[PDB]
């Protein structure tokens, strides 16, 4: 009764400014569920789960009710030239569906479930206790030259022996695994599906088998291991798309320890954003931290694991829409692309600061990038683009080449836009770039190769898809990846699940076809990650 009067004063909030939602077109339970079913299959990626706008404009009731029914239907139908697909013209969605979507986006967005520690512990499993795991490598596999290839639509990954070109094992994982990452010791393989299911695989057991797993969210893209000296296999971190968050777990058993929300203020307008999806994550070699990229808010956070109980985080403003990126040759600056901002943020991991924001081309997509010493400009880091066919070379040596540091020092020209990965290797004198999503078939089925010993000359075209001899299908080639020796470059010919695919190997020394890996179990192969190169960031 004392506690009653103590909190018995009015809230400073003005009810007239608290807004009730509604005034949308009446639509039944089924009309709504069908619209909801379509929204995540076709729209959520670009517009966001909450519809506050990611790559695309906000689709919340305030704005959609203002536009009204007809503007909405027409827009969804014909699309626009700035990224909005023509769902009606292309005949991808019927007029009836487009009508339901126009009505759906006029209601309050349905709420997706949260996902904290209770759900994480319930999903967590230790398949083989640490004490029951091999003390030595119980097999004759050349682990360093192994490849962890993603069999996207099969919810599996494949361990392919680099020298023999044969599949050594197919392991069940999360659906469409996005990337593979190696532990600092080179013993454990870490794969994470887009569904946020992480699988830890012991490469030492008789046969590479799974020793632990967990689900850190409803949707995810990144996973990483602690690499600072004295912290081998200590912690594993993973970033989720929804909910906006990242989790730190034990690097031996994947036991969840800390969960941190990334919901916050943007760097540009400094207003509140409800869905800042976590993207790339890279382990720092300069301090005991993980370097996390928060997309929609454009913040690079340095999560310090020196004391995992009292988490110290340093919020660095970069630029909106941070995505992928990698280390420069020295492994001190984090070159990451803020793709929809057309800039490349450089994060100094030693001095823990933003070194610069470099203007590049339309929608940079470096992947992890390509590092090499330019004969004139010195040490550079490069990236290709999705929005155009240009290739940016950036200065990454402040000590010996300060006049070029953090500048778009030169530009190269590929086959065209739709590019996703650019590759190279220390031992190699070639530079490869794919064009996976280029709207042309001939271009999307081939890669461009440049001569680093003569960058003035144009690129040669390698007909990767044609070399694979597969037959029908889009046969989109993607992500060049070298072997440990650096004399073989691998490519994935990403064909439909009901079609036939392959991994095409090329002799880097001669640019001649070396081999083609086919197998009924090689369903929709995407990411290939050579152990050594992924473990030691060789790119």
> Which residues sit in the known binding site for heme c?
43, 46-47, 67, 80, 84
Binding status of residue 435 toward ligand DHE by CB under 6 A: no
Among its own copies, ligand DHE, ligand HEC, none, what binds residue 367 when CB lies within 5 to 8 Å by partner kind? ligand DHE
144 contacts 538 by C-beta, under 8 angstroms: no
Binding status of residue 9 toward ligand DHE by CB under 6 A: yes
Query: What spatial distance separates the first Cα and last Cα of the chain, rounded to whole Å?
Result: 68
Find the farthest-apart pair of alpha carbons in the chain and give their distance in angstroms, rounded. 86
Binding status of residue 28 toward its own copies by CB under 8 A: no
Among its own copies, ligand DHE, ligand HEC, none, what binds residue 347 when CB lies within 5 to 8 Å by partner kind? none
312 contacts 357 by C-beta, under 8 angstroms: no
Which candidate in 273, 331, 365, 425 is catalytic? 365
Residue 368: strand, helix, or coil: coil
- Indicate left, alpha or beta for 104 from its phi (over 0: left) and psi (-120 to 50: alpha): alpha
Phi first, then psi, for residue 332 (nearest 5°) are -130, -30
Minimum CB–partner distance for residue 100 and ligand HEC (Å):
10
CA pair distance 391, 393, nearest whole angstrom:
7
Q: Is 331 part of the annotated catalytic residue set?
A: no
Nearer to ligand DHE, 290 or 467 (CB): 290
Binders of its own copies among residues 428 to 447 (CB under 8 A) are 437-439
Q: Is 43 part of the annotated catalytic residue set?
A: yes
Q: Map residues 104-143 to x or -, x wherever contact with its own copies holds by CB under 8 A.
A: ---xx-xxxxx-xxx-------------------------
Binding status of residue 215 toward ligand DHE by CB under 6 A: no
- Pairing type for strands 256-261 and 264-265 reads unpaired
Binding status of residue 419 toward ligand DHE by CB under 6 A: no
CA pair distance 259, 246, nearest whole angstrom:
6
Side-by-side strand order, sheet with 256-261: 219-225, 235-242, 245-250, 256-261
Structure tokens at 207: 């046969």
Nearer to its own copies, 14 or 132 (CB): 14
CA pair distance 96, 84, nearest whole angstrom:
19
Binding-site residues from annotation: 43, 46-47, 67, 80, 84, 178, 221-222, 241, 368, 479
Among ligand DHE, its own copies, ligand HEC, none, what binds residue 270 when CB lies within 5 to 8 Å by partner kind? its own copies
Binders of its own copies among residues 314 to 343 (CB under 8 A) are 314-317
Q: Is 285 part of the annotated catalytic residue set?
A: no
Nearer to ligand HEC, 101 or 409 (CB): 101
82 CA to centre of own chain: 23
List all residues 6 or more positions away from 502 whose beta carbon is below 8 Å from its beta carbon: 468, 470, 493, 516, 517, 518, 522, 525
Nearer to ligand DHE, 9 or 18 (CB): 9
Binding status of residue 386 toward its own copies by CB under 8 A: yes
Part in contact with its own copies (CB under 8 A); list of ranges 36-44, 403-411, 422-430, 508-516:
36-44
Breaks (C-N over 2.5 A) in the chain follow: none
Among its own copies, ligand HEC, ligand DHE, none, what binds residue 75 when CB lies within 5 to 8 Å by partner kind? ligand HEC
Residue with tokens 């000359």: 457
Minimum CB–partner distance for residue 344 and ligand HEC (Å):
21
Structure tokens at 71: 């503007």
Phi first, then psi, for residue 256 (nearest 5°) are -65, 135
Phi first, then psi, for residue 504 (nearest 5°) are -105, 120
- Indicate left, alpha or beta for 324 from its phi (over 0: left) and psi (-120 to 50: alpha): beta
Nearer to ligand DHE, 281 or 300 (CB): 281
Binding-site residues from annotation for heme d1: 178, 221-222, 241, 368, 479
Phi first, then psi, for residue 364 (nearest 5°) are -60, 140
Minimum CB–partner distance for residue 403 and ligand DHE (Å):
30
Residue 148: strand, helix, or coil: strand
Among ligand HEC, ligand DHE, its own copies, none, what binds residue 369 when CB lies within 5 to 8 Å by partner kind? none
Q: Is 67 exposed, middle or buried (0-12, 13-18, 19+ CB in 10 A)?
A: middle
Closest CA to 478 of 518, 431, 444: 444
Helix (H) or strand (E) holding 532: helix 531-535
Nearer to ligand DHE, 423 or 514 (CB): 423
Binding status of residue 243 toward its own copies by CB under 8 A: yes
Nearer to ligand HEC, 54 or 531 (CB): 54
Binding status of residue 2 toward ligand DHE by CB under 6 A: no
CA pair distance 343, 462, nearest whole angstrom:
29
Binders of ligand DHE among residues 141 to 160 (CB under 6 A) are 152
Phi first, then psi, for residue 261 (nearest 5°) are -75, 140
Binding status of residue 13 toward its own copies by CB under 8 A: yes
Give the footprint of ligand HEC on this chain (CB under 6 A): 3-4, 7-8, 38, 42-43, 45-47, 55-57, 59, 63, 67, 72, 75-76, 80, 82-85, 87, 101, 105
383 CA to centre of own chain: 15
Q: Is 46 part of the annotated catalytic residue set?
A: yes
Considering CB under 6 A, how many residues would be counted as binding ligand DHE? Answer: 22
Binders of its own copies among residues 448 to 487 (CB under 8 A) are none
Binding status of residue 281 toward ligand DHE by CB under 6 A: yes
Nearer to ligand HEC, 329 or 339 (CB): 339
Nearer to ligand DHE, 215 or 323 (CB): 323
Q: Which residue is nearest to ligand DHE (CB)?
A: 527
Catalytic positions, written as ranges = 43, 46-47, 84, 323, 365
Footprint on this chain of ligand DHE (rule: CB under 6 A): 6-7, 9, 45, 152, 176, 178-179, 221-222, 279-281, 323-324, 367-368, 421, 478-479, 526-527
């Amino acid at each position: 009764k004392a506690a009653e009067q103590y909190q018995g004063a009015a809230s400073a909030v003005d009810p007239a400014h608290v807004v009730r939602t509604n005034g949308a077109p009446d639509m039944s339970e089924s009309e709504f569920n069908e619209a909801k079913q379509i929204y995540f299959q076709r729209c959520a990626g670009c517009h966001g789960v909450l519809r506050k706008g990611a790559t695309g404009k906000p689709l919340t009731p305030d704005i959609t009710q203002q536009r009204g029914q007809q503007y909405l239907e027409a827009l969804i139908t014909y699309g626009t030239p700035l990224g909005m697909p023509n769902w009606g013209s292309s005949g991808e969605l019927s007029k009836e569906q487009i009508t339901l979507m126009a009505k759906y986006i006029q209601h309050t967005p349905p709420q997706p479930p949260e996902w904290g520690m209770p759900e994480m512990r319930e999903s967590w499993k230790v398949l083989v206790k640490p004490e029951d795991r091999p003390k030595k490598q119980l097999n004759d596999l050349d682990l360093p030259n192994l490849f962890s290839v993603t069999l996207r639509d099969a919810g599996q990954i494949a361990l392919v022996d680099g020298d023999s070109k044969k599949i050594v094992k197919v392991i069940d994982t999360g659906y469409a695994v996005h990337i593979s990452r190696m532990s600092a010791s080179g013993r454990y393989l870490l794969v994470i599906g887009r569904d946020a299911r992480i699988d830890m695989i012991d490469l030492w057991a008789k046969e590479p088998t799974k020793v632990a797993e967990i689900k850190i969210g409803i949707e995810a893209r990144s996973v990483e291991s602690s690499k600072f000296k004295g912290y081998e296999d200590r912690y594993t971190i993973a970033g989720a798309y929804w909910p906006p968050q990242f989790a730190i777990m034990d690097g031996e058993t994947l036991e969840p320890k800390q969960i941190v929300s990334t919901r916050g203020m943007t760097v540009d307008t400094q207003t509140y954003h409800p869905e800042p999806r976590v993207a790339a994550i890279i382990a720092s070699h300069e301090h005991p931290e993980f370097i996390v990229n928060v997309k929609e808010t454009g913040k690079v956070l340095l999560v310090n694991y020196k004391d995992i109980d009292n988490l110290t985080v340093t919020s660095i403003g970069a630029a909106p829409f941070l995505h992928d990126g990698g280390w420069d040759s020295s492994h001190r600056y984090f070159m990451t692309a803020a793709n929809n901002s057309n800039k490349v943020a450089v994060i100094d991991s030693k001095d823990r600061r933003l070194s610069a924001l470099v203007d590049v081309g339309k929608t940079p997509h470096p992947g992890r990038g390509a590092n090499f010493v330019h004969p004139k400009y010195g040490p550079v880091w490069s990236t290709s683009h999705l929005g155009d066919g240009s290739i940016s070379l950036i200065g990454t040596d402040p000590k010996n080449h300060p006049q070029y540091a953090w500048k778009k020092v030169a530009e190269l020209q590929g086959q065209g836009g739709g590019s996703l990965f650019i590759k190279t290797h220390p031992k190699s004198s070639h530079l490869y770039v794919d064009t996976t999503f280029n709207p042309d078939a001939r271009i999307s089925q081939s890669v461009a190769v440049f001569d680093l010993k003569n960058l003035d000359a144009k690129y040669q075209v390698l007909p990767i898809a044609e070399w694979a001899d597969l037959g029908e299908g889009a046969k989109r080639v993607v992500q060049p990846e070298y072997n440990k020796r650096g004399d073989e470059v691998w490519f994935s010919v990403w064909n439909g699940k009901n079609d036939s695919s392959a991994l095409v190997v090329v002799d880097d020394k001669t640019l001649k076809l070396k081999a083609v890996v086919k197998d009924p179990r090689l369903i929709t192969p995407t990411g290939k990650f050579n152990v050594y190169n992924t473990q030691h960031d060789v790119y």
